[PDB]
Structures are given as C-alpha cells and as structure tokens.
Amino acid sequence: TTIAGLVFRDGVILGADTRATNDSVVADKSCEKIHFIAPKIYCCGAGVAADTEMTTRMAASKMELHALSTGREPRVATVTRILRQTLFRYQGHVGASLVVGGVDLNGPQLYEVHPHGSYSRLPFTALGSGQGAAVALLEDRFQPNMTLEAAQELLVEAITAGILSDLGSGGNVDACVITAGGAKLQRALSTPTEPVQRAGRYRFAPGTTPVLTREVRPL
C-alpha cells in the first residue's frame, strides 16, 4: 500500500493505490483507501485493512456527531487528536497508519498518525509499504506553495512510483483534492496498467459438467 499527502497553496491533496493483498496474493484490485471523515476532511489508510476501515468510520461518525452538536465545520486538528488517543489506548494492536488532510478556518493541514498513537504535522508525507518511493519523489520535487495542477501531478507521480516499485502496491491511483471551496474526490485519477484483453475463450457448452443431483425452487 502506497499513500501520500501533499500541501499546496489552495489546499491539500491525498493519494492512494487500489491494491489489497491477502497473504502474498492479490484479493482486491479496486479498493478505496481514501476515507470520508468530514465533507472537507479525508484520511488515507494503510496497515490492517479492517483496522483502517473501522478506525476511520469511527472517527467519521464521531466527527459528524461533533459537527452536529457544535453546528460548525469540524477541525482537522480535532480529528487527529481523536485518532491518536483511541489508537494509543490499544498500544499499536490496531494496525492503522493514516494520512489525514483537511481544510479549516485555520487553513489546509496535513497530519500523519501511527498505530501506536504518535502523530506529526508536515507539508508532505507518505506511509505504507511503498512509502520509500513516494517520499523520494516528494523530497525530490516538492516546492512550497505549489499550484494545484503541479501538486496533482507530483502526487500522482509519487504514488505511481510506489505502484511499480512495490509488490504490495498496485492498481490505479486515487486522488482527493481539498480546497476551501470544495473537496473533489477523483477515483481512478490515473491508471498505469490496463490489461482487459484475453486471447482464449474458455466457455463451456451446457452439459459438459456432470451433475448427480438437481433441485429447483420456484419463486
């Protein structure tokens, strides 16, 4: 899993791949690793898939509740702290490494949070199995106050780097752009690999399969 966060002038951008691996075999070629928390806050999940999913949904639920009682647009700083304390309680047994980014009254913010409960605030980061590749690109080609379009392209490049270089990373690259005006989630932003094509047709004429028993219930 390769996930990255980028901070630019008008807001933040988050990226993820779409590959979920069971054992050393690929189970899902199209899974959503960018998670809804608040209308303007999203989180990228790497680690134990079930843990990332449930921890994320928990946060999102709490954040909605918070917004309802508050009556105000939720803070990303709030989301980060909620996550830390929950994750700290479990002493790293909840395998969730997350990249959380959002826009506030306080501006655009990017946080990374680790399953043990540590957090750090920074302009750019990458987590997961392919983090090395993604950090390399950001370290190489990151300037502050990048235009959205340059930021979009760099993030894609950073995540693409992980897809090809890492075995536990593959599929399409998903990006989520968060600006004060809006948050645009772009699934399948870029797809490096498309193999639909098959050369053989493995079809079977009915009756090829030997059946001992038949029973039909009409509805």
Partner 1 sequence: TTIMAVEFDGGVVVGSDSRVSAGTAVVNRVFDKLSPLHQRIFCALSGSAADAQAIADMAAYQLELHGLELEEPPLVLAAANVVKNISYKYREDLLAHLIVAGWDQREGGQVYGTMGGMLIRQPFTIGGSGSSYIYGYVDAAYKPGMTPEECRRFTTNAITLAMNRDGSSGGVIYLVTITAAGVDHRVILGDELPKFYDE
Partner 2 sequence: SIMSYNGGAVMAMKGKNCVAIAADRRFGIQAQMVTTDFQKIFPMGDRLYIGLAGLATDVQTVAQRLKFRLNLYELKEGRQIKPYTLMSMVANLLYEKRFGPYYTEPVIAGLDPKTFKPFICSLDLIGCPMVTDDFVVSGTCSEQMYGMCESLWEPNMDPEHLFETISQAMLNAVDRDAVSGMGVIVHVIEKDKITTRTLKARMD
Partner 3 sequence: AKRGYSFSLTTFSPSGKLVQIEYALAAVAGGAPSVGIKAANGVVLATEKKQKSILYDERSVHKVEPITKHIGLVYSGMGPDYRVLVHRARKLAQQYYLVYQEPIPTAQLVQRVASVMQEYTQSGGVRPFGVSLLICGWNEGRPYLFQSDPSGAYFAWKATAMGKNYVNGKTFLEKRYNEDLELEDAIHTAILTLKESFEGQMTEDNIEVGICNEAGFRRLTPTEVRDYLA
State the catalytic residues: 1
> Within a 13 Å sphere around the CA of 189, how many CA atoms are in the beta-carbon half?
25
- Three-class HEC string of 181-204: CCEEEEEEEECCCCCCCCCCCCCC
Please list, in sequence order, all residues whose beta carbon lies within 8 angstroms of the beta carbon of residue 84, skipping any fewer than 6 positions away.
113, 117, 118, 119
Residues 129 to 188 in contact with partner 1, rule: CB under 8 A: 132
Amino acid at 105: L
Rule CB under 8 A: is residue 120 a binding residue for partner 1? yes
Residues 108 to 167 in contact with K ion, rule: CB under 5 A: none
Tell which one of 9, 28, 122, 192 touches partner 2 (CB under 8 A): 28
Tell which one of 114, 130, 160, 163 touches partner 1 (CB under 8 A): 114
φ/ψ of residue 173, rounded to 5: -105, 125
Residue among 109, 143, 112 nearest 127 (CA): 112
Rule CB under 5 A: is residue 33 a binding residue for Cl ion? no
For residues 151 and 163, which CB has a smaller minimum distance to Cl ion in the complex? 163
Rule CB under 8 A: is residue 32 a binding residue for partner 3? no
Q: How many residues bind partner 2 (CB under 8 A)?
A: 33
Tell which one of 9, 29, 89, 141 touches Cl ion (CB under 5 A): 29
Scanning 6-14, 31-39, 62-70, 116-124 for contacts with partner 1 by CB under 8 A, the matching segment is 116-124
